[PDB]
Tab-separated table of C-alpha atoms in Angstrom:
chain	number	residue	atom	x	y	z
A	2	UNK	CA	-11.756	-0.162	-1.101
A	3	UNK	CA	-8.984	0.720	1.300
A	4	UNK	CA	-10.307	-2.226	3.306
A	5	UNK	CA	-9.817	-4.337	0.202
A	6	UNK	CA	-6.241	-3.102	-0.253
A	7	UNK	CA	-5.584	-3.995	3.360
A	8	UNK	CA	-7.051	-7.545	3.128
A	9	UNK	CA	-4.798	-8.100	0.136
A	10	UNK	CA	-1.735	-7.056	2.112
A	11	UNK	CA	-2.670	-9.457	4.921
A	12	UNK	CA	-2.911	-12.175	2.336
A	13	UNK	CA	0.544	-11.425	0.940
A	14	UNK	CA	1.863	-11.503	4.497
A	15	UNK	CA	0.279	-14.851	5.194
A	16	UNK	CA	2.020	-15.916	2.009
A	17	UNK	CA	5.532	-14.880	3.230
A	18	UNK	CA	4.796	-16.432	6.610
A	19	UNK	CA	4.011	-19.763	5.003
A	20	UNK	CA	7.217	-19.692	2.961
A	21	UNK	CA	9.371	-18.674	5.934
A	22	UNK	CA	8.107	-21.590	7.994
A	23	UNK	CA	8.880	-23.914	5.039
A	24	UNK	CA	12.440	-22.581	5.000
A	25	UNK	CA	12.685	-22.884	8.759
A	26	UNK	CA	11.846	-26.591	8.390
A	27	UNK	CA	14.419	-27.054	5.632
A	28	UNK	CA	16.948	-26.138	8.315
B	2	UNK	CA	-6.422	8.297	5.829
B	3	UNK	CA	-6.088	6.057	8.867
B	4	UNK	CA	-6.713	3.020	6.698
B	5	UNK	CA	-4.354	4.014	3.909
B	6	UNK	CA	-1.775	4.596	6.618
B	7	UNK	CA	-2.465	1.059	7.860
B	8	UNK	CA	-2.211	-0.488	4.429
B	9	UNK	CA	1.050	1.332	4.081
B	10	UNK	CA	2.440	-0.070	7.333
B	11	UNK	CA	1.337	-3.484	6.194
B	12	UNK	CA	3.164	-3.124	2.901
B	13	UNK	CA	6.335	-2.294	4.813
B	14	UNK	CA	5.961	-5.371	7.002
B	15	UNK	CA	5.363	-7.387	3.843
B	16	UNK	CA	8.673	-6.398	2.254
B	17	UNK	CA	10.472	-6.978	5.551
B	18	UNK	CA	9.178	-10.507	5.684
B	19	UNK	CA	10.490	-10.837	2.128
B	20	UNK	CA	14.022	-9.848	3.175
B	21	UNK	CA	13.797	-12.242	6.111
B	22	UNK	CA	12.845	-14.999	3.740
B	23	UNK	CA	15.887	-14.500	1.444
B	24	UNK	CA	18.105	-14.357	4.563
B	25	UNK	CA	16.642	-17.693	5.626
B	26	UNK	CA	17.553	-19.580	2.475
B	27	UNK	CA	21.119	-18.310	2.717
B	28	UNK	CA	21.349	-20.136	6.031
B	29	UNK	CA	20.413	-23.439	4.443
B	30	UNK	CA	23.553	-22.674	2.469
C	2	UNK	CA	-10.135	1.395	21.276
C	3	UNK	CA	-10.456	-0.906	18.303
C	4	UNK	CA	-8.465	1.298	15.962
C	5	UNK	CA	-6.062	1.787	18.803
C	6	UNK	CA	-5.745	-1.976	19.494
C	7	UNK	CA	-5.037	-2.441	15.789
C	8	UNK	CA	-2.215	0.110	15.857
C	9	UNK	CA	-0.897	-1.752	18.893
C	10	UNK	CA	-0.825	-5.051	17.017
C	11	UNK	CA	1.116	-3.453	14.199
C	12	UNK	CA	3.661	-2.035	16.594
C	13	UNK	CA	3.864	-5.478	18.185
C	14	UNK	CA	4.585	-7.135	14.866
C	15	UNK	CA	7.254	-4.606	13.965
C	16	UNK	CA	8.686	-5.599	17.343
C	17	UNK	CA	8.935	-9.317	16.596
C	18	UNK	CA	10.442	-8.440	13.215
C	19	UNK	CA	13.132	-6.460	15.011
C	20	UNK	CA	13.768	-9.454	17.301
C	21	UNK	CA	13.895	-11.777	14.297
C	22	UNK	CA	16.333	-9.593	12.335
C	23	UNK	CA	18.542	-9.752	15.460
C	24	UNK	CA	18.678	-13.555	15.522
C	25	UNK	CA	19.611	-13.515	11.833
C	26	UNK	CA	22.373	-10.972	12.300
C	27	UNK	CA	23.464	-13.132	15.222
C	28	UNK	CA	23.270	-16.376	13.318
C	29	UNK	CA	25.481	-15.132	10.534
C	30	UNK	CA	28.007	-14.065	13.163
C	31	UNK	CA	28.477	-17.679	14.255
D	2	UNK	CA	-16.895	-9.025	8.773
D	3	UNK	CA	-13.752	-7.744	7.079
D	4	UNK	CA	-12.948	-5.102	9.693
D	5	UNK	CA	-13.867	-6.944	12.831
D	6	UNK	CA	-11.541	-9.805	11.814
D	7	UNK	CA	-8.547	-7.554	11.208
D	8	UNK	CA	-7.596	-7.162	14.874
D	9	UNK	CA	-7.715	-10.940	14.978
D	10	UNK	CA	-5.788	-11.323	11.733
D	11	UNK	CA	-2.897	-9.133	13.028
D	12	UNK	CA	-2.760	-10.835	16.409
D	13	UNK	CA	-2.415	-14.223	14.736
D	14	UNK	CA	0.515	-12.969	12.700
D	15	UNK	CA	2.118	-11.619	15.846
D	16	UNK	CA	1.725	-15.048	17.450
D	17	UNK	CA	3.298	-16.468	14.318
D	18	UNK	CA	6.335	-14.236	14.417
D	19	UNK	CA	7.018	-15.000	18.070
D	20	UNK	CA	6.978	-18.672	17.261
D	21	UNK	CA	9.419	-18.018	14.416
D	22	UNK	CA	11.642	-15.922	16.705
D	23	UNK	CA	12.027	-18.868	19.173
D	24	UNK	CA	12.901	-20.926	16.170
D	25	UNK	CA	15.798	-18.780	15.088
D	26	UNK	CA	17.170	-18.376	18.593
D	27	UNK	CA	17.327	-22.180	18.718
D	28	UNK	CA	18.964	-22.670	15.326
D	29	UNK	CA	21.342	-19.930	16.471
D	30	UNK	CA	22.590	-22.606	18.844
D	31	UNK	CA	23.831	-25.089	16.194
């Protein structure tokens, strides 16, 4: 429940991390 | 709760990463 | 503790974020 | 399980941010 909410946040974060690294490589 | 608290901290970190992302594309110009 | 170690990891992350936001502030000053 | 992996999941992210922070410091030097 709360654990689910949490896992979903981690996922979102792994999303932003992927996109940041893609930007970083653009530079 | 401890967990809700944790989710909450994670949300904050999420949004922060978001800001960082938009700041990163600016640098590409 | 495990809960404790978790809270430590969060603090640690918030600490890299801080570092990162510094480099960005720096970068756009040069 | 879900819980037991969390400590690991955070740590990884931490390792990821540090990597990214070395990245920016470098680019800072262009």
